[PDB]
From a paper:
Ciliary motility is regulated by the conserved nexin-dynein regulatory complex (N-DRC), which links adjacent doublet microtubules and regulates and coordinates the activity of outer doublet complexes. The N-DRC is a large 1.5-MDa, ~50-nm-long Y-shaped complex with two main regions: the base plate and linker regions. The N-DRC bridges neighboring DMTs and restricts sliding motions between DMTs. Here, using cryo-electron microscopy in conjunction with biochemical cross-linking and integrative modeling, we localize 12 DRC subunits in the N-DRC structure of Tetrahymena thermophila.
Here, we use integrated modeling and cryo-EM to model the entire N-DRC structure and some associated proteins from the ciliate Tetrahymena thermophila. In addition, we reveal that the N-DRC is associated with a network of coiled-coil proteins that most likely mediates N-DRC regulatory activity. We localized CFAP337 and CFAP57 and showed their interactions with the CCDC96/113 complex. We also find that the CCDC96/113 complex is in close contact with the DRC9/10 in the linker region. Our model implicates CCDC96 has crosstalk with the N-DRC. Therefore, the CCDC96/113 complex may function as a signal transfer bridge for the N-DRC that runs from radial spoke RS3 to DRC10 and vice versa. Our model revealed that the N-DRC is connected to an extensive network of coiled-coil proteins on the DMT that span the 96-nm repeating unit. Our structural model also shows that the N-DRC regulates ODAs and IDAs by interacting with a network of coiled-coil proteins. We hypothesized that the N-DRC conformation change during ciliary bending can be transmitted to the coiled-coil network by pulling force. N-DRC stretching can pull on the highly elastic coiled-coil protein network.
Author numbering:
A (entry chain L): 407 to 457
B (entry chain B): 52 to 102
C (entry chain i), H (entry chain I): 1 to 185
D (entry chain E): 1 to 104
E (entry chain D): 54 to 105
F (entry chain L): 509 to 862
G (entry chain L): 1 to 305
The structure:
């Protein structure tokens, strides 16, 4: 199961960053687009709870 | 007290080896510096061509 | 260095020793041409092997025998190897026994202070016997006084002890490369 | 308190009966010459290996020094590249603003 | 003395493999270095073209 | 509970240290040593003399190459810190919450415990006799001591419990009148009670380690049944002694001569543990001696006296260490499992029913 | 040279992780292909495979843990922490598998101390590569809980024993003699009295040697020996000169050896790590700045979220 | 000095060597009459051989022991040598343990500074124990401080090291030639 988790997380890293351009991120700051993808579900869940 | 036919008096092999390999490594390092003659000449000529 | 108290095989071994130590010291003292080093380095070359030649000794016996028929400013190693071989075999210029220096400094310090003033040491080694140059005398005084520039006297006993220790250390280093050579078939 | 070491009956070693008990004086002279230079064939192997190992370790130190130097100069070069790219960005902004100086 | 020889030989082998590691790392760093000079030169060309 | 443990010296912070503090060279000739040990065992298995064979088989398998300091550190890391410092590692790895440390004084037991606690940010709970002696005189008092130490350990993750000199709690009453308080051997009962209760959850970042300077005095069966894994810190080998000597010399910054007999001093120190080795080194090199070091070179005879004066471990203690480790770790069980012949059958065992 | 090397090294670590996963799967692929028959896959081969996988996973753990600790991207850092814990678990599993398969020498020793010397030599790796360093993220993660715990512990230490430092196991030296102060005084007194008696005997012997040498000199002088003194100092200086020439040549030789030691390689140079300009300390300031940058970057990422 | 754990022949050889060194020490203070020295020189002849009796121990036992039935200001070497040989064989008055002196000096330096004030040492030696003469106190201070006039605190560790070196050198001088020591028939 550890090997399977490693494969899954490697695929995650690939699909998330291997096609991402790091030329403009000299200092290695957090990516705002990945932040948005991580953040949208929180608001979705809050709205779902209220409704 | 056994120090002159198979115990002690064999300084030469590897002390005359000390000096002979001093000769050999001097030759080899001079040859390395001569090879670096061409290496650094190519680098310098490229820089001048670059410059 | 050379020990003439051996059999035929060990005698040949020590002959080739003297030869090879000449070769190695010469190699360390060579500038351009293999097998030839300046006669001036001859005292230095063979002190590298364990000889204590007087400068007059080097001028009078070491050089004339090693030189060729015509006056030349260089020595062939092929020639100094036989001469230095005989020299080391006979131990003509090996560093004499250290109480020699002990008595030398005792005689120099005529006043029996337990030490010799730097000025007195300078006078003794510049006007008595073979004359040190300025560099030789200054370095002598420095090492004898333990690198104390402010000392007005030289601790001759301390210098003698340190000189004996350094002589033994370098002679051991030289004999590291004294011994082996096997009869080559 | 000091536990004084006992005055035990000293060794008086009954000299082991090894192979060292079966030769005469001439056989000595021979075994002398048979172990007298070589055992420091081996000690000289030790000395030459010491020379070699010291040379090896100092050259490894040199290689690590070169690695660190190249790392540091790569860092300085990257800093220069970043600062000069910032200069390029500011120049681009300044020209897009010079679309204002030309307007004026 | 035999044990001394064995120990020193072991140390020599270890530091020889250390030669190998250090030299390969140095070569990698030098290749990165050259790539970075090329990067700076290309960036200079691009910036000059933009200025033009 | 944590404040009370601190007041009683139970709960504390150990000195910042790393497991690498265990100075011991990697087992460069480990496979060769194992091959030679197997060959020696095979040779001893073929003897014709019954008494000689019995005597050869009776002694602990000293032929086994003692674990290197690097191997000790690797095992400590994998089996504790991963369970200790990483909660996911603890959850998904071997669920062993107790370990037994064997080794001589200064061999690295206390040092390794402190290194684990510091490097994992684990607060330590030293319930060892050296830490609790003269403080507790009631069995109920010891019960409360153990309960509070374990509670603090579990609560303040990471937390570890340390019992140095483990041989004094799980001792045998059949022995003579022991100097250590039998009330201290009394901690064995609460330890078994807590272990059978399983207070340390698999995800809990807590482990109890019994470090003993006298594992032979420890119980082989009890150490088998109490601690999941056993870590043994053997005395420095030739290479380990060289590493320790060089490390201490560089720590004291004493210049090293070119032709200095470092290996010679290592051999003269052969059999000296790390702690005694460093004590002898410091005694040879004092503050004024350190000052004179620039004046006086290091001499081999400088350790002839100090080495004979610093505590030294007997080869009998070496063999006892090896025997107890081999037994407790189950090594002897594995050895015996393969040498049992299957010729004997299940025949008559009924006639002698009277 | 910090961030780009970090990213490339993480990419290489991921590639090695794929390589190890493929090396694990390949035995599975062969088994699926050819377990219509039965593999004579001996425990020796299985143990060798598991030892190789265990060393590879130790390396993968080390690299991934370092990347998680240093790489300044927090979005990267969280997943890197997760996968590093996964690598921890897989490495321990490989260790257990190596223990299981440790059937070398036809014996089933399932110990946790595998001797990987031969495998490391075959794979061309350092003996030090077998060393497993403890994580710093163990202290790092949830440090606020750990920070509070250690702060409370230090407060307890200060309030109880007035010292928050770790306690020291007392090395009670066995060389402490139980003697009185007067006992020590009189022991030193005996030492000094013996020394002074030795000195008095030596002084008497030296004095007697003085009279004996004076008498011998007087007898020699009466013997009509004309001892020249001029050449005494001259020969003294000459012998001093020969010795000094020897010493100067020896010092030249030893300095030549020292220079070979430095340049040609005969000597290491012990650099002062405490020096800020020392490569280590400069690059240490490097990590200090870069780790404060990492802290501020995680702060910025959280604020952006 | 003497090795009491040797064979019969080695024991006899070392006994004769001790007798020779006893005669040497006794002649060290034999001033006017040969074979007898002032009983006050008895402690110093005693210490020459590596035995360090205190003044009280000397006056109580060594003086009367080698003194005739009627106490005498001078003690004949005839009686001196047997007791000296016995003491050398038994290591009766041999210098105390270096560790014992280290512990004693640690006690004197109650604060563990690594050094002991010379004033405090003078007070201890002249007012406690067998009170030294001022000369004895000054000699001890000089040897402990390395003849440092500015010295006020004695670093007992290196003082003991210096005492060990001096005593070892003296004992080696007394015991030298034993390997080349030949016993007459």
């Amino acid at each position: 199961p550890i090997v399977l988790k490693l494969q899954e997380q490697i695929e995650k890293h690939s699909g998330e960053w291997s096609k991402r351009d790091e030329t403009n991120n000299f200092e290695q700051k957090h990516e705002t687009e990945l932040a948005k993808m991580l953040i949208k579900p929180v608001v979705e869940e809050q709205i779902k709870q209220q409704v | 007290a056994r120090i002159k036919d198979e115990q002690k008096v064999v300084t030469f092999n590897k002390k005359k080896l000390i000096t002979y390999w001093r000769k050999i490594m001097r030759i080899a390092k001079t040859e390395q510096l001569k090879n670096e003659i061409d290496i650094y000449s190519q680098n310098n000529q490229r820089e001048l061509d670059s410059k | 260095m050379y020990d003439p108290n051996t059999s035929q095989t060990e005698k040949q071994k020590q002959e080739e020793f003297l030869k090879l130590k000449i070769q190695e010291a010469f190699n360390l003292f060579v500038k351009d041409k293999k097998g030839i080093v300046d006669k001036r380095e001859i005292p230095y070359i063979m002190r590298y092997l364990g000889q204590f030649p007087s400068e007059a000794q080097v001028r009078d016996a070491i050089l004339p025998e090693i030189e060729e028929d015509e006056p030349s400013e260089f020595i062939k190693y092929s020639k100094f190897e036989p001469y230095m071989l005989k020299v080391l075999k006979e131990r003509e210029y090996e560093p004499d026994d250290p109480e020699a220096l002990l008595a030398a400094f005792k005689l120099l310090d005529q006043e029996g202070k337990g030490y010799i003033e730097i000025d007195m040491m300078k006078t003794f080694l510049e006007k008595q016997g073979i004359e040190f140059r300025e560099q030789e005398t200054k370095s002598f005084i420095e090492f004898a006084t333990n690198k104390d520039p402010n000392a007005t006297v030289i601790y001759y006993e301390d210098y003698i002890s340190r000189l004996q220790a350094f002589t033994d250390k370098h002679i051991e280093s030289v004999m590291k490369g004294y011994n082996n050579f096997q009869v080559k078939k | 308190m000091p536990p004084k070491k006992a005055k035990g009956k000293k060794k008086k070693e009954e000299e082991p009966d090894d192979e060292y008990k079966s030769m005469t004086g001439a056989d000595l002279t021979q075994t002398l010459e048979k172990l007298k230079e070589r055992v420091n064939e081996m000690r000289t192997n030790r000395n030459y290996i010491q020379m070699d190992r010291d040379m090896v370790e100092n050259f490894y130190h040199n290689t690590l020094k070169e690695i660190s130097e190249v790392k540091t100069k790569i860092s300085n070069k990257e800093t220069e590249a970043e600062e000069k790219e910032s200069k390029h960005r500011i120049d681009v902004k300044v020209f897009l603003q010079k679309v204002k100086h030309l307007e004026y | 003395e035999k044990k001394l020889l064995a120990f020193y030989q072991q140390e020599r082998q270890k530091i020889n493999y250390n030669w190998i590691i250090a030299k390969k790392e140095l070569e990698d760093k030098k290749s990165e270095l050259i790539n970075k000079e090329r990067e700076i030169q290309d960036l200079q060309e691009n910036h000059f073209m933009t200025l033009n | 509970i944590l404040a009370g443990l601190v007041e009683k010296r139970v709960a504390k912070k150990l000195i910042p240290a790393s497991l690498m503090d265990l100075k011991g060279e990697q087992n460069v000739l480990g496979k060769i040593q194992e091959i030679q040990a197997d060959e020696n065992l095979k040779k001893t298995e073929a003897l014709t003399d019954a008494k000689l064979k019995k005597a050869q088989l009776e002694e602990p398998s000293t032929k086994m190459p003692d674990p290197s300091i690097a191997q000790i550190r690797q095992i400590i890391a994998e089996y504790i810190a991963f369970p200790l410092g990483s909660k996911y590692a603890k959850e998904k790895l071997d669920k062993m919450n107790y370990f037994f440390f064997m080794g001589p004084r200064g061999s690295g037991k206390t040092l390794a415990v402190r290194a684990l606690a510091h490097e994992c940010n684990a607060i330590v709970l030293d319930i060892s006799p050296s830490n609790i002696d003269g403080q507790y005189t009631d069995k109920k008092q010891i019960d409360g001591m153990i309960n509070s130490a374990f509670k603090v350990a579990k609560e303040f993750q990471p937390a570890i419990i340390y019992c140095e000199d483990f041989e004094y709690i799980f001792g045998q009453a059949k022995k003579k009148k022991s100097q250590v308080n039998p009330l201290f051997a009394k901690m064995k009962k609460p330890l078994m009670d807590f272990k059978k209760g399983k207070f340390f959850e698999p995800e809990d970042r807590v482990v109890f380690i019994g470090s003993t300077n006298r594992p032979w005095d420890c119980s082989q069966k009890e150490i088998k049944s109490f601690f999941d894994k056993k870590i043994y810190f053997p005395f420095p080998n030739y290479g380990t002694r060289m590493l320790l000597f060089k490390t201490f010399l560089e720590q004291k910054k004493v210049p090293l001569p070119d032709n200095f007999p470092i290996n010679t001093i290592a051999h003269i120190t052969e059999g000296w543990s790390a702690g005694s080795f460093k004590m002898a080194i410091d005694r040879v090199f004092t503050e004024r001696r350190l000052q004179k070091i620039n004046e006086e070179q290091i001499k081999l005879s400088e350790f002839i006296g100090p080495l004979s004066n610093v505590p030294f471990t007997s080869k009998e203690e070496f063999k006892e260490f090896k025997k107890f480790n081999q037994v407790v770790t189950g090594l002897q069980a594995n050895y015996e499992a393969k040498k049992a012949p299957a010729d004997d059958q299940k025949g008559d065992k009924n006639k002698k029913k009277k | 040279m910090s961030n780009m090397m970090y990213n490339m090294k993480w990419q290489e670590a991921i590639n090695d992780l794929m390589e190890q996963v493929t090396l694990e799967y390949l035995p599975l692929e062969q088994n699926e292909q050819q377990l219509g028959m039965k593999y004579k896959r001996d425990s020796s081969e299985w143990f060798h495979f598991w030892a190789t996988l265990y060393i590879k996973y130790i390396d993968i753990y080390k690299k991934l843990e370092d990347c998680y600790d240093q790489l300044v991207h927090p979005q990267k850092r969280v997943l890197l922490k997760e996968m590093l814990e996964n690598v921890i678990v897989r490495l321990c599993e490989t260790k257990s598998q190596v223990v299981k398969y440790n059937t070398q020498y036809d014996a089933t020793y399932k110990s946790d101390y595998p001797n990987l010397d031969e495998l490391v030599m075959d794979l061309k790796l350092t003996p030090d590569c077998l060393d497993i360093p403890i994580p710093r993220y163990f202290r790092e993660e949830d440090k606020k809980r750990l920070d509070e715990r250690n702060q409370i512990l230090d407060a307890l230490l200060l309030e109880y024993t007035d010292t928050k430092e770790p306690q020291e196991e007392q090395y009670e030296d066995q060389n402490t003699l139980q003697a009185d102060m007067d006992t020590a005084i009189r022991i030193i007194q005996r030492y000094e009295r013996g020394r002074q008696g030795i000195e008095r005997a030596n002084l008497a012997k030296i004095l007697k040697k003085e009279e004996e040498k004076k008498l011998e000199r007087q007898k020699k002088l009466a013997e009509g020996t004309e001892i020249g003194e001029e050449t005494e100092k001259d020969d003294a200086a000459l012998v001093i000169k020969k010795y000094w020439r020897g010493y100067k040549s020896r010092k030249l030789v030893q300095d030549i050896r020292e220079e070979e030691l430095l340049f040609l390689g005969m000597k290491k140079v012990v650099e002062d790590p405490t020096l800020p300009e020392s490569q280590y300390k400069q690059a240490q300031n490097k990590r200090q700045k870069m780790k404060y940058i990492q802290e501020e970057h995680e702060q910025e990422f959280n604020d952006e979220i």
